[PDB]
Each structure stands twice: as structure tokens, then as C-alpha cells.
Amino acid sequence: MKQDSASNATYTVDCEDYVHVVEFNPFDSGEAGSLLAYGGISYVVIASCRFQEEDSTVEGIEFKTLKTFHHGERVVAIAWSPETRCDALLPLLRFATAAGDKKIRIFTSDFQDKNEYKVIEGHSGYINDLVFCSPEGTDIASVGDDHTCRIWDLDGKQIAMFILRSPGMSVAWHPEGAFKLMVAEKTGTIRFYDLTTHQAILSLESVQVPLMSADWCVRNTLRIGAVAGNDWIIWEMPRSSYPQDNKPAHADRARMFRWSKCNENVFATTGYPGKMKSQIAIHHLAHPQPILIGTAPVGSGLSWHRRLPLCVVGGYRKLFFWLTEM
Amino acid sequence: LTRQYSHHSTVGDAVSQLDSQLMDITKMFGQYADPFRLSECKLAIIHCAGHSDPILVQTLWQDIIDKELSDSMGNSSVDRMQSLHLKITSLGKIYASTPRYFPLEFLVKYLEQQVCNFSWDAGFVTYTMQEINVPVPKLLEVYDHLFKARDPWWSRMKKPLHLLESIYILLSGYVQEPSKVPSYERRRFTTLCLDAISCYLVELQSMDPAPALLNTVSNFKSLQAKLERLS
Amino acid sequence: LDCLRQLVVVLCERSQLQDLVEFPYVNLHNEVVGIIESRARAVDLMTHNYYELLYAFHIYRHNYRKAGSVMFEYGMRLGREVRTLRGLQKQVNSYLACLNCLRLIRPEYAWIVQPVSGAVYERPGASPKRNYDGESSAVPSSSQIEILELRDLEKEYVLAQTRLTLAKHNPSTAAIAGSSAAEEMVALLVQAGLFDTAISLCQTF
């Protein structure tokens, strides 16, 4: 008997539709509130979130839907453009989605009448992950079950294609490096590509398979974190191709891994969606056990707030937020 | 407006309009308090309206402090310190009962940054907050938080011991006059001070040995031995 | 030592009492005991469990003698400071825990060391008691040490148990019963009509 005291979510917001993915804007939108996107069965909702921890005028959470986009298909992944700004004389909302129809859609909006989307075709399998290039915002990387990593301009033209040895499961741009791309493969291989040389720089191998998610630490560009099988795995580059840490994350497989955007020692993992509840575990590298354990009904997405030690997971028709101490 | 803007061509018309009728708070804010940058009047307006924006409240307190520091630029360092003290005490006595309009942690942090910038007495902020009737235990909680936050600002200013000097002055004042803390909480508060001083002494031992650091360690050991006589 | 003080305080505040008991404390064991004892001496007996922690800490290391001494000190302080029905119940439990610890020790070593009733435990950090002339009164340099055997602890246990039986029968008497000598306690038990407990007390004393 240790009653796993599953912590309640710090905040909970009701949604009009099922949440299948959720992503905070990791960029500065120039607004006081953090931009959040969530994808449902046929819609993408863009919202502003303000928290009492960043703004003493808010009691708890202020959640405001800014815009709802008709998407027509189930959204699987969302990526923010670094050009997204709401405080400008001309606000620009730009994000990309991957969906159940194997297409990418780039949405561009002024929050007024100008609402345009571009459809990008070329993936022959499901797209598992997609990301904008952070610093230029001009390019989108995507990975999928067609065993390709593809690079697109905003015009939907394929600039580059890398053939993978298995399904691509996650993709991340180097936080400081416009031409460095991490691609994580389902067989446990994580590869780094240079887009100027079109070459693989280096690879990492997971001690478990399948690898389901990987993330590049923004606060420490030497750290890579992933989930594979039941474990979370951390590497510190360039010191070794072997993992520095490998520890149990979840009993019934780990699904998502994300680094905190404010702390290089904090990350969250999600369990595979069981029939009733997904477990969420917040970890700190100085501790052998999770510092927080939460639960969501059918956990979908995992994202971190830009400034606060606050993570979000979608579940059923709700967003669940967990704040951790720093 | 009559006192600070007497030379401005629009103030005669503004004053006559303010006599001619009672105005709504919204009109007072947008037509008079905002155009004339009246941060004290803006603070009174949002207090009266029950409108609570913590960022706006901090900005208004900053503008009040910065204006008082600007208006006093021709005066001696002591007169500038006294002018700001009288200003902050006068407004603090109005708003300190309502924590939504008195952002104590921001005010302590910001005033301690000004004490460092002007090379004023480290006692200034601790004295001013006590004269507002800020409870000594609540003021210690704020200083303990500011110290534990490890703000790189203090090291950049070459004043890494400043918050510990302010804590030493605050706690030395409590040891001299234990009646500043209500009798029912005094024992609990003295224990909290002994635990906090023990933490500060461990952190001071982790820093490079400088003459100023050795003096701070001596001061905290002397303070510990005085608090053990009060427990 | 200052880092050790900080560790002990933070673990006690976080309620992570297991880690504090399990740590090896190579050469630091007496300092940890001194820090927790100093805090157990400084804090209120009803709000924080530092004596119960010191007891758990000594039981885990098979130091039954020090465990008994700590629980006996706890029982004595509860009798002085906490004259409530709940304080008397904790006092009886702490003397019972002390007796149980000493019964686990070989009879030859089954004794506790006390400073005689009237040794001013100067609170560590009390201003030196100045005489009328402002001079530091010289510390009376003989803390006479009393050695309590298991039989004397059984008398103190029976006395605390009789105080608790009176306080359970009449809750208004708990304040009086807490200070009563064995002779005064016989008179109070006789007024209540608890004659067998008074006879048992007369036989033990």
C-alpha cells in the first residue's frame, strides 16, 4: 500500500469537441496570455490562456477562445510558426496541422476576415509529427509511416526528403541552428541531419523499442529525451551515443515525451491511452521518482507553457493543466 | 492637475470641466488620469472600481516611485530617500490592507534595487514597510523568497549580500523590540527565524571568502545567539 | 554542520521522515541527534512530532537505551507543559514505550540518566540570567545526575496512569492531576471514589 496519490489537475477547461492534440505556442506572440491550439475531430481551436501565476489580476485560469477553424478531418499534430504575433498592428496567426488524411495544412489568419489555408500533399502514410524551423519560420519538417522525413516551404513545395529505415515518430529542429534536424525512428534510432550538406551528422540508439516520442531540450541543446517501450531515456551529446539515464516511465508503454520550456531538468511523459485513463508523469532529473503523477481520460497531446512550469494534456472534451514547483 | 500642470494650456479647461459636474470613473480614467499620466489617481480609480490587474498595479507603483525619484533629482541623497519614504508610507497606509493593490513582493524588490542604485541605507525598505504596518513575519517571508530566488541582478550590481543585510537589519529590529510581533505568535516566529538563519549561514559558507561575507556570517551568528535567548 | 541543520529542517518540514531515519550519518550521528533534540526542546509538544521522530530514529538503529531516554524526556515534558487529557494520554504512552525499550535491553544496562529535578535546562539561546548587579550568574557547576532504574520508571508510569484514570473519570481534574505528587494523588483518587487505584498507588509508593 502506497496509494499512488494521483494529483488532480491544477486547472481544467471544458472544450466543445474531443481533444486529440494540444500545443502551446512556444514562441513570443507579444500578448500577455499564452496562445494554445487544440485539434478535435473536424476543428482546430485557437485560444489565449492567462494564469494567476503570471498575472495577479487573474483568479485561477482565464481561458478565451480566439478562433475556431473548420478542418474537416481528425487532427493528429499541430506546429506553431515563429512568425505568429497577436500584438502587432497586423496580427499574424500561422500554424500547420497534420491529419488523418495524410495531408499537412498551413493556416494563416489576421484574426479578422483573412483566413486562408494551404494543403500540402506528398506523404503516402500517416504523418506522426511536424514542426516549423525555429529561427526563420519558412520551412516545415514532417515525419510519418511512409518512412520519410520531408521538408516543405510555406508554398507546399518539397525542398528535401530523407529516406528513413522505419516509420518516423518525432521531428525537432535544433533550437539555435536553422539547418540541424533531429528525426526519431520507431526502431529506436534518433538521427541528426544537416540540411546544408544533406548528410546525417550522428545517431543515437534507444535501449528499448518502439521509440514513440523524442524531444530536443531548448534550454540545453546537448540534451535529448525520448520514450521507448516502458521507459524514458535521456542522452547528453556529444559525450556518448549511449543513454545517460534510462528509467521506467509507464507500466503499459510510454507514448509522449516533452521537455519543459523553462527548466532543463524537468520533463513530462504520458502513458499509452488505456480504455479509461492515461497517466501523466512529471519528472525532475535530480529525483528517482516522478515529482507529480496526474491522470486524464484518454490523454491526447502533451505540451508545455513557454514561461511557467505548467504542462497541458487534452482528454475527452477537456484540457487538463498541471503546475509543478521549480 | 492644478499643482503639476498649471502651465499646460489644456488644464484650465480640464479643471473647469471637473468643477462643472460629477464624473464617472471611466471618464476620469480615460480623459484625465491617462493623458496626464496621473499614476496615483489611476491607482485610486482601479481601487474604487474594484478592478484588479496585478501587472497594471505593479506598473502604476513603478511609475509613482520613478516619478518621485525624478522630481527629487535636484535634492540631496538623504532628502531623496526621505521624499520617497514619505510618498511610499502615505500610499502604503491606504493600500496595505488590500493586498490586490499593494504588491508587497514587487515593492520590496523594486525599492531594494533603488537602494542599491543610489547607495542608500540598507535599512530604508525594512523601516518604510514597518511604518506602513507590514507585519515583520510577512516582510521576512518576502525577503526569504527574494533571497531564495537567486536573482542574477544582485551579482551583476556587485551587491550579492544586500538582501541578507536587509534581513539582518529586520531581524535585529525584532530582537531589540520583540513587541513588534504579537505575543501569541512570537515563539513560533523566533523558531522560524532560527531555522531561516541556519539556512542563510549554510548558503554563506558555500560562497567565496570575502571580508564582507565574513562580517555577514559574524552578524548572523550574533543574531542567532540573541534569538536563542528570546525563545 | 550548517548544511546538516538545513537538511534536517527541510526534511522535517517536507514530512520526508523515512529518508531522515535511513541515512547512515557516518560521524555526524551525534550532531543530527543534537539538532533534532534542540528542535524537540524548542517546539510545542502538541503540534510537531520530533520526539516520536527521535524515538523512530533510535529504534531503527537498535539504540533502545537512547530511544527510552528520549521517550522518558517526552513524558516528563508532557507532564509539565501539557496538562490536558490528550497530554496525559501521550505521557502514559511515552512512559510505556520507554519501559518496553528498557525491557529489550539486558538488565545490567537498563537505566536512564536524568539531570535532577531543579537543574535549569537553560533554553539554548536564553540571555544569561543576570543578577540584580548585571553580572552573569556563574552556572551552578554541578548538574547532579540521577540514575533511574526500571523500578523507578515503573513508579512514574503507574503515577502517570493513575493521573490519566482520574482525568478520564473527571475531565475538569486534568489540570490538577498533572502536577499532583503521589500523596496528593491518593487524596484526589479518594475524593473521586477510585479506592483500588489509590490502594495500588499506596502499594507502589
Q: How far is A33 from chain B (nearest CA, A)?
A: 12
CB A232 within 8 A of CB A284: no
Centre a 10 Å sphere on the Cβ of residue A213 and count the other Cβ atoms it contains.
22
| Maximum distance among all Cα pairs of chain C, rounded to whole angstroms | 57
Instruction: List chains adjacent to chain C, taking adjacency as at least 3 C-beta pairs closer than 8 Å.
Output: B
Residue B203: exposure state from Cβ atoms within 10 A (0-12, 13-18, ≥19): middle
- Whether B199 sits inside 8 A of C126 (CB atoms) is no
Pairing of strands A299-304, A148-153: unpaired
Is there a contact between B195 and C9 if contact means CB atoms under 8 Å apart? yes
Strands (E), chain C: 111-115, 145-149
Q: Quick check: helix, strand or coil at residue C18?
A: helix
Which of B175, B222, B229 is the best residue to mutate to test the C interface, defined by the most C CB atoms within 10 Å of its own CB? Answer: B229
The full length of chain B comes to 231
Longest dimension (CA), chain A: 59
Long-range contacts of A138-147 (CB under 8 A, 24+ apart): A140/A79, A140/A96, A140/A104, A140/A106, A141/A171, A141/A173, A141/A181, A142/A98, A142/A104, A142/A171, A143/A167, A143/A168, A143/A169, A143/A170, A143/A171, A143/A183, A143/A184, A144/A102, A144/A168
Q: Are B56 and A57 in contact (CB < 8 Å)?
A: yes
Whether residues B202 and C123 touch (CB distance < 8 A) is answered with no
Rounded to 10 degrees, the C-alpha dihedral B135/B140/B142/B148 comes to -170
Q: What is the DSSP letter of C82?
A: -
Whole-angstrom CA distances from C14 to A325, B194, C9, C20, C101 are: 13, 18, 9, 11, 28
Among partner residues B198, B224, B228, which is closest to C126 by beta-carbon distance? B228
Taking the C-alpha atoms of residue B68 and residue B73, their distance in angstroms, rounded to an integer, is 9
How many angstroms separate the CA of residue A263 from the nearest CA in chain B? Answer: 14
**Contact between chains at B191 and C5 (C-beta distance less than 8 A):** no
Resolution stated for this PDB structure, in Å: 6.9
Contact indicator for A171, A157 with CB cutoff of 8 Å: no
DSSP codes, B62-101: HHHHHHHHHHTTTS-HHHHHHHHHHHHHHHHHHHTT-TTT
CB contact under 8 A, C3 and B195: no
Contact A22, A314 (CB under 8 A): yes
How far apart are the CA of A231 and the nearest CA of chain B, in angstroms?
33
Q: Which H or E run includes A314?
A: strand A310-315
Q: What number of residues does chain C have?
A: 205
Q: CA angle B135-B140-B146, nearest 5°? A: 130
Contact B194 C44 (CB under 8 A): no
Per-residue burial over A243-274, b if 16 or more Cβ lie within 10 Å, else e, is: beebeebbeebbbbbbbbbbbbbbbbbbbbbe
Q: Which three cell numbers stand for residue C72?
A: 522518558
Contacts of B200 in chain C (CB under 8 A): none
Q: Of A311, A270, A296, A263, which Cα lies nearest the Cα of A51?
A: A311
Residues in B touching A53 (Cβ below 8 Å): none
- Work out whether strand A61-70 and strand A266-271 pair parallel, antiparallel, or are unpaired: unpaired
Cα separation, A71 vs A103, whole angstroms: 11
Is B95 touching A (CB cutoff 8 A)?
no
Q: How far apart are CA A145 and CA A52, in angstroms?
A: 41
Classify strands A139-144 and A177-185 as parallel, antiparallel or unpaired.
Answer: unpaired
Place of cell 516520442: A213
Q: How far is CA C48 from CA B56, C3, C170, in A?
A: 42, 22, 28
The span from the first CA to the last CA of chain B, in angstroms, equals 54
The answer to whether residue A32 neighbours chain B at the CB level (below 8 Å) is yes
The secondary structure of C154-203 as a DSSP string is HHHHHHHHHHHHHHHH-GGGHHHHTT--HHHHHHHHHHHT-HHHHHHHHH
B91 CA: distance to closest CA in chain A (Å): 20
**Which residue, among A248, A247, A298, A293, has the nearest Cα to A272 in the 3D structure?**
A298
From edge to edge, which strands make up the β-sheet containing A115-120? A75-80, A93-99, A104-109, A115-120
Bridge partners (DSSP) of residue A67 are A46
Q: What is the largest CA-CA distance in chain B?
A: 68
Kindly list the residues of chain C whose beta carbon comes within 8 Å of any beta carbon in chain B: 2-3, 5-6, 9, 42-44, 123-127
Question: Contact at 8 Å (CB) between B143 and B167?
Answer: yes
Q: How far apart are CA B78 and CA B81, in angstroms?
A: 5
Q: Is residue B201 less than 8 Å (CB to CB) from chain C?
A: yes
Phi, psi of A56 (to 5 degrees): -60, -10
Map residue A309 onto helix, strand or coil: coil
How many whole angstroms separate alpha carbon A106 and alpha carbon A78?
Answer: 10
